[PDB]
Write a protein that binds this DNA or RNA. Sequence first.
DNA 1: TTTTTTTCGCGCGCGCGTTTT
DNA 2: TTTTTTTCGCGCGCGCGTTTT
Lengths: 413, 413, 413, 413
Amino acid sequence: MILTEEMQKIMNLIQDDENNVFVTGKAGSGKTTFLKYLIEKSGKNCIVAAPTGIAAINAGGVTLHSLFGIPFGPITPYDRLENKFSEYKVELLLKMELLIIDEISMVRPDILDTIDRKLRWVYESDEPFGGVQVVMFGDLFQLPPVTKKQEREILSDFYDGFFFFNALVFKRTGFHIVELTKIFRQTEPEFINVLNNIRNYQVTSDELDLLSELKDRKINEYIHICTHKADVEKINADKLGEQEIRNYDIVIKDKFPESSIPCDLHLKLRVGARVMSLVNDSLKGYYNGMLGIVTALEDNVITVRMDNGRTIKFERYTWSNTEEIGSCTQFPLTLAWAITIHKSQGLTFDKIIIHVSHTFCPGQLYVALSRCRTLEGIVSDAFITKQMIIPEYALIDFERAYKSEGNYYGKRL
Amino acid sequence: DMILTEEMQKIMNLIQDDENNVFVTGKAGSGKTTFLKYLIEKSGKNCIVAAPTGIAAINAGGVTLHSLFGIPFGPITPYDRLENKFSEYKVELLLKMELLIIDEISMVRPDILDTIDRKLRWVYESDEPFGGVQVVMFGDLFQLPPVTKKQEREILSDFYDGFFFFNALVFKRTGFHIVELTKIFRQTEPEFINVLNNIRNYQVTSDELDLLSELKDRKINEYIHICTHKADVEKINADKLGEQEIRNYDIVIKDKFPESSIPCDLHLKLRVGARVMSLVNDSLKGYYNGMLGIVTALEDNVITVRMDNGRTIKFERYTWSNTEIGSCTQFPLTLAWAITIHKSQGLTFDKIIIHVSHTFCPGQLYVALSRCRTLEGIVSDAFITKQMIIPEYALIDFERAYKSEGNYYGKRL
Amino acid sequence: MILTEEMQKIMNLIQDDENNVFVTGKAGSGKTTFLKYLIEKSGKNCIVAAPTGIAAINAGGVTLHSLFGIPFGPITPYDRLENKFSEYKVELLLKMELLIIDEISMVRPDILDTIDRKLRWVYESDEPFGGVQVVMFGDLFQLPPVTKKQEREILSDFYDGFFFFNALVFKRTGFHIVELTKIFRQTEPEFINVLNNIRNYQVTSDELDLLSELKDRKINEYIHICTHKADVEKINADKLGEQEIRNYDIVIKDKFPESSIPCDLHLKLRVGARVMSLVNDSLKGYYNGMLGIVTALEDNVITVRMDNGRTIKFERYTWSNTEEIGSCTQFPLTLAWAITIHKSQGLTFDKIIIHVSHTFCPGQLYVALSRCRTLEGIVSDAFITKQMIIPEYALIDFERAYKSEGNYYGKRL
Amino acid sequence: DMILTEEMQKIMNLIQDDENNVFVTGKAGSGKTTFLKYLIEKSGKNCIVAAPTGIAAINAGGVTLHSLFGIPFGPITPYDRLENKFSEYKVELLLKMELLIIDEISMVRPDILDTIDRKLRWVYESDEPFGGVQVVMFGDLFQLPPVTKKQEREILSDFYDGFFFFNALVFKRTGFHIVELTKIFRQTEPEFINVLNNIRNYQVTSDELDLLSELKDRKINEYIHICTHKADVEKINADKLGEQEIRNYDIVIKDKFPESSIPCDLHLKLRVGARVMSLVNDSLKGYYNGMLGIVTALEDNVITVRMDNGRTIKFERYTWSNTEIGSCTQFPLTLAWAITIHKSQGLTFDKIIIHVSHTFCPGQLYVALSRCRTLEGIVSDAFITKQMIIPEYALIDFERAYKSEGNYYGKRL
DNA sequence: TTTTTTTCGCGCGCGCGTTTT
DNA sequence: TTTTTTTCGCGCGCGCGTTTT
Ligand SMILES: Nc1ncnc2c1ncn2[C@@H]1O[C@H](COP(=O)(O)OP(=O)(O)O)[C@@H](O)[C@H]1O
Ligand SMILES: Nc1ncnc2c1ncn2[C@@H]1O[C@H](COP(=O)(O)OP(=O)(O)O)[C@@H](O)[C@H]1O
Ligand SMILES: Nc1ncnc2c1ncn2[C@@H]1O[C@H](COP(=O)(O)OP(=O)(O)O)[C@@H](O)[C@H]1O
Ligand SMILES: Nc1ncnc2c1ncn2[C@@H]1O[C@H](COP(=O)(O)OP(=O)(O)O)[C@@H](O)[C@H]1O
Ligand code: ALF
Ligand code: ALF
Ligand code: ALF
Ligand code: ALF
Ligand SMILES: [Mg+2]
Ligand SMILES: [Mg+2]
Ligand SMILES: [Mg+2]
Ligand SMILES: [Mg+2]
């Protein structure tokens, strides 16, 4: 691992200055690698979180929703929060000196405000975030936070936009913006060039021509990633096959809409199947997004050898729909040869097959291509076109604002 | 017919070097207390044996820590003044001692160990930890933890990072090796052992617990009743006592003595043939806290009991002091067909009836089940469930720390 | 009031000797008058009770069932008692030094044993009645305790008879028997003579001839008393009339057999109606058996001027049938021109009309006649015959036993 | 326009004889505190005024008993040693005093009066009760009783037959007359008064309580909120405070000071116009415990308040001691739109909102309702029921005792 | 069109509401 | 066929289980 001069300056900033900091940079600029270095070398008590389970594991932490007990759905400044933290969690949050959030680009502003409110409650303080110093890592030109149209309508009454920096807490505090400008994941200068111009919406037809060889390229080592969950399910079912399959049915109890069920209705597995854990269970040593391989199937237990070498015996898990109207019980596992691009953000691969024939988020195409260390390792189902790129001009405005104002956003303290 | 294993031999040879403290640990029934007695018999050192409970002390051949070291009740801080009122007999015994042996260390508070450190340094007029005495601790942190109330923990929390023996402040100035015995002797059934072990470490599954389904209401005075709660113990003892030929002995209280602080029975009810336990130590008369016997005669002021160890003892009334404001006088005996799980820790039985429908301590269910040599010898009032298992995550942290640092904890010398 | 030599000897016995005492004597021998004197002059803390509400008021106390929280129905030595005493009641019973029970002849043995068990519970003692000294007043040749045939069958498995002295506590303790032999209520020697021979079953036809003038004697001052509740209801309804009547209906909620309802189904009242309270409410100043006159009737309040001068506003009361299956709500009042002979025991009147054409209890005829200060004040509906007298030969045996054994019954201490 | 009644004149003339203590009592709003001020104005005696609560003391023109006599918290037994640390100013004031005036005596513990007795006898170097000072007590035993926890009562129960002021041991060596004021002035509606009176003495009926049906959710900053619970007070105060232009002042705690022992606000939140109350006495600066005012300015270290009495005061931070182990520093102010019923006792209002859905003290409901001059001025959150009434039977006994013994209690001199 | 929580538990006890230099 | 109970209450907190000369 190489410690660059940019990284050294940021280390010294964080040690000398308690202000919040946004550490940003293009795909594969070493942000998560540097995150882990910062903690190891800092003398501070650090807690690591991320918006998705996979990204959290990649950073060595847990989801924001788990750490802070955050409910699903949009949270307005007038909603009352249930403060039901255990004493271990209160103590952990009080002991914490540095809150580290990775992949900040996918964090909603009301999530950050909920964290602010919950930390101020835990600390019994009026200081933003309870006085904890916050260091955020990510790339706003990758995927934005997941919001449904109805949620955006509710939030639009209080928020001028749907990115983390729109949080109301940044009227009372702010952060420096620093950037890492050396690419490490890729080494080919022309591949990097097209990536960068996709990222900032300034790619030309001629530059995208470099990627013509991706589509239907002639070749279990290749990882599939898809824009759509429906595509993920088809690819996973194909790779699963019909040899030696066991089926495990969900048990639903009372109210539980089918579109709200967090798990598989009919979990179909075989020995050798690539799977992902859906839930966190620190007692059993597994966490949301951890990957492994099924090694045995029984009546009430599924055995999976995790990538980290641990063998785990999974039992069924019970979700609540809330006030407990209905519940559902099922093994917390799902097939995982294919994954969404949203879940892929943060990971690195040598060989990938991307399914981007229909993109619908800013940054989605950019994230998909930038997972791979080399150009030759990408296969595509479709020619790469400018129509796959969706600009978000509110991000141009944001960067223009802080870059012309001393690389700082929000209330100066 | 006592097997000396290779693990036991290595520990003997380790201890030879009178400069490194050692924690000898291992699962229930791995021969820990058996090996303690071997170490002493074969060592050339002057050894003293102690344990936190009277039953465990007798089982190890020693006395309670509170009796040996004159320890008061309630939390002791490093700033509390200790009464150093040892007789010359006791001072001489402690000066002659070369090896302090503590069994069932898991139930020893950290402030208890520090009080022992302070008292031994006073006796030895030394600044060396424990007065220079070598300390060998025996037990299993995954059995019952020390009994503490929330208020006592609150006082201690200003000085201690946790409430286990290894949190003692003396282990900033000294430390100990950790060694383990990994062969189970008490049980012989491999599948029974596997369920015990997986209950112990919080990773038992529903399917494994199905092995224990036959415990509840199993069809069969040979069975020993072991209960989570003292109130249940009292009910079972009164049933077995019956109403035939009962004699009652009332406590005499003199002045101030809260009823919740009385150490003995308020109304001691006995008959010839009753199974009883001594509550106090009187080495001159040959009886000790936790010793078991059978009532052979009842008189106005004398109860004759033939002890299990073959001695016949004539018990008279004993006088406790509450400090001197008030006192209470009563025979130091109590019924003992039934006992608490806390009192059972350390003992072995062939046939038991366990009352674990309500467990409230980590390790409580594990201790209860692991007393019995065979599965068939256990009867339960309730199905055994995961809700009976209570994790103590401070123990996971502790084992992770010492296992990665050479099986040693505390200040390296 | 005259203090006789018999009374003086009993006073000195009770002061010098903590043994229990049965104070007995014929009707109108001053027992209840002397009871009140004993308390006034004793230095002991005394509590007064009686089996019926009227008798309790006459003695200045409360019913045994209320004082000790006794359920209805027979209580066997194997039934478990609910010990649900308030702290005031526990303290009152602990403060009590002398338990005084009037009209003991109507107290069942299992009631006394329940009191024994409850007092031993309150005092945490094995001494009979918790060590309290018990002084009982009454006349075994008056009415016996009320028992139904089914209750007698249950009790006959444990009890050799159905009088208070058959209680099992009198195998562990006993009492002196003393007697008052001077009649005060009546002054006519020949009236006294016939009363006495009715009482002891040795009246002759010629002696009963003295009472011939009672039947249909030519004359609101006369009080009616009846053997049967049905007769009481008819006489009360006659005297109530149909002028200016208001009706108040019971509200029954769920399970409540009509033969188990403690109150009136359709309470019919008018201003001027003679009524009796059915329940105790010390807060409002009224108690079971207290007598008064209705002064006003409203929608939800009935106003009664009690004999003691207090004006009371009665609201509806709610009984429980038990575990609360059903309940009933009603004003705790009932008409009371007529009363049963059982309720009359203990009271004195100048003028009475007795309805004894059908008697069914030993002592019933004797109690009815002996309420009146003079012979001329009695009117009867029927000629007085030997068939109205029902001997209980178990009482002859009892008196023979104690009179020949030093006027003591039970275990001598 | 203050009416001097014949009852008041007789009490004035009674007191003239400086050798008989007097208890002046009467129902809520009978002019007791008004007459107190008259007695002093017209008496030629040197009078000192005190009360158990700060609000009541201000209402009577005096100071708290704890401040006047330097009384520690917690129960004081006759064997506890008192710190007699009075300044010469205080000693001289107490020596000059001729009449000790105590208002709201119902909330005064008996051990408090004995501490005052002991301290005055020390100051006067005398064995005469209260040092020979004449004591006149004002209050209503059917309002709130003194605040005691069960543990404090347990300690005191070894020496005291009850927990009201008249149980003080000094009343074995002295006594007092009881006089009463029986004309209500605060209210004028006879039917409203009748319901107040019948709630007060535990004899209100359902039909009488029907008069109060219109209280619940009555349609209307003029209304004062009075609550049973401090937690409710805090909620109402925060609502009225709002979130416009709020300044927060945090407590500074230094070392040992349990959070449940802090006398002030942890986070004092204020704005200009906020209704506040002083928490401490500083006679030099002209403010006293319970004095009410309005915030006029907020600064870093100074809050300017125009008091109700016309004085403008500049409050600085105050330092409490916990004994010296730890201390806490904070402005001695708290919001006071809402107040507890305990703090309201003694005050009069035209318009109130009472929160009595959960009452837990005798007299609490009565005090709440009786603050208001008219029925229409009361709004309630709940229907008024008999379950809100809590009898204290020790008061019935007390009134029975003194009323039958010449309206005098204690040792007659 | 895309993602995302929560460390054991039944039961009795009794606080609640006040107050210093 | 005849007589006879029980003094406020919702809610949070946390014990439980141990131990001297
Ligand atoms: N300082 C570095 N030295 C060497 N290789 C690096 C360095 N930083 C990143 N890399 C490589 O590039 C990859 C990018 O890591 P990561 O921080 O997860 O991506 P991003 O920079 O987009 O957050 C790493 O997996 C690593 O292989
Ligand atoms: N080396 C050995 N050979 C034979 N039996 C043994 C050996 N070690 C222990 N045991 C048996 O295993 C059981 C465990 O008893 P004990 O040592 O008191 O509990 P623990 O091992 O949990 O301290 C005892 O019955 C003992 O006889
Ligand atoms: N010692 C006495 N002196 C005068 N009159 C008495 C005396 N004892 C009883 N009486 C009269 O006789 C009546 C009997 O009283 P009581 O004791 O109730 O009846 P009993 O003696 O049957 O219990 C009293 O009401 C009273 O009028
Ligand atoms: N003699 C009087 N004449 C006129 N008003 C009076 C008289 N006595 C009391 N009041 C009024 O009755 C109300 C009762 O107030 P206060 O005396 O403080 O309460 P309490 O009487 O309960 O001590 C006050 O508003 C007071 O003005
Ligand atoms: F954090 Al990245 F690609 F932006 F792994
Ligand atoms: F650890 Al053991 F009996 F001493 F299980
Ligand atoms: F007690 Al009676 F007649 F026997 F009044
Ligand atoms: F007794 Al008051 F206001 F002083 F009701
Ligand atoms: Mg990253
Ligand atoms: Mg052992
Ligand atoms: Mg009588
Ligand atoms: Mg007043």
